[PDB]
Amino acid sequence: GYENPTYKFF
Amino acid sequence: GYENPTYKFF
Amino acid sequence: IIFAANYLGSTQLLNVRMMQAQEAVSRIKMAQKLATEVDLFILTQRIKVLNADTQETMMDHPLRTISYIADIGNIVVLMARRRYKMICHVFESEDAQLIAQSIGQAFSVAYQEFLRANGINP
Amino acid sequence: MEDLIDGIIFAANYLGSTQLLSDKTPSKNVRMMQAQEAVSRIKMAQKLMTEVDLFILTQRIKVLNADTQETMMDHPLRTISYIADIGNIVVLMARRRYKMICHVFESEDAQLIAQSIGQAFSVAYQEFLR
């Protein structure tokens, strides 16, 4: 599985 | 995959 | 980058995330066993899933609102916000692993671009 | 015996080629998105492959037709900017046409092919330095 490090910033 | 370091000076 | 897959279904949510992807797959699987062809445009800006024969946009997700992608066998779980009020689209694909690997790269690139916008050198 | 200096060969299936505009020296992740892209365009075309021998060495990349052994592709290692193995798929990106040219192959030796080209890269770049 891949987590988008950018999602949590918005 | 890999990057050819030489390719740039041409 | 465009890949082909079959839109199976979607679930909603309001190591744990890996599980959530799982619950979503099962949910969809039970859906199928009780009862369309698309093409996926992957980009640093967004993920666009369209109806294959028509070419009408089914879902248009701005990459920033997507958090998780998983390849569970030949299945693909696309988890995105607002629709913390998230939605999970499940797709069956010949190349589910390639699709997830590609979205992950999109994540990596857009994140680099993210840091650059905030004055941070990636 | 044949080493990497003479050139070594791997069986592969040519799938087709594509193109793109890329910055001169992109980051690795963006360079993977390029490879993945070539593979995408290739596959969509295969839904909407005759055998070859891949010749790799410190001096050039060649593709001979598995049967006739006629040279089908020959590229100076200088013109090859990146190479990647995506599963059993191999993506070879070159210069000249910035517009880049991508040849896509399929092989059970994709991982060994990439290794081999990267090592070719190393050999040629250090030669250049000294």
UniProtKB/Swiss-Prot annotation, chain C:
According to the record's subunit comment, the protein's assembly and interactions are:
Part of a multimeric complex containing STXBP1 and STX1A. Interacts with STXBP1. Also part of the brain-specific heterotrimeric complex LIN-10/X11-alpha, LIN-2/CASK, and LIN7. Component of the brain-specific heterotrimeric complex (LIN-10-LIN-2-LIN-7 complex) composed of at least APBA1, CASK, and LIN7, which associates with the motor protein KIF17 to transport vesicles along microtubules. Within the complex, interacts (via PDZ domain) with the motor protein KIF17; the interaction is direct and is required for association of KIF17 with the cargo that is to be transported.
User: What organism does this protein naturally occur in?
Assistant: Homo sapiens
Top-rank lineage group of the source organism: Eukaryota
The UniProt record lists the PID domain at 1-122
Functionally, this protein is described as follows: Putative function in synaptic vesicle exocytosis by binding to Munc18-1, an essential component of the synaptic vesicle exocytotic machinery. May modulate processing of the amyloid-beta precursor protein (APP) and hence formation of APP-beta. Component of the LIN-10-LIN-2-LIN-7 complex, which associates with the motor protein KIF17 to transport vesicles containing N-methyl-D-aspartate (NMDA) receptor subunit NR2B along microtubules.
**Protein name per the record:** Amyloid-beta A4 precursor protein-binding family A member 1
Tell me the domain comment.
Answer: Composed of an N-terminal domain that binds Munc18-1 and LIN-2/CASK, a middle phosphotyrosine-binding domain (PID/PTB) that mediates binding with the cytoplasmic domain of the amyloid-beta precursor protein, and two C-terminal PDZ domains thought to attach proteins to the plasma membrane. The autoinhibitory helix linker occludes the APP binding site.
Where in or outside the cell is it found? Cytoplasm; Cytoplasm, Perinuclear region; Nucleus
Tissues with expression? Brain and spinal cord. Isoform 2 is expressed in testis and brain, but not detected in lung, liver or spleen.
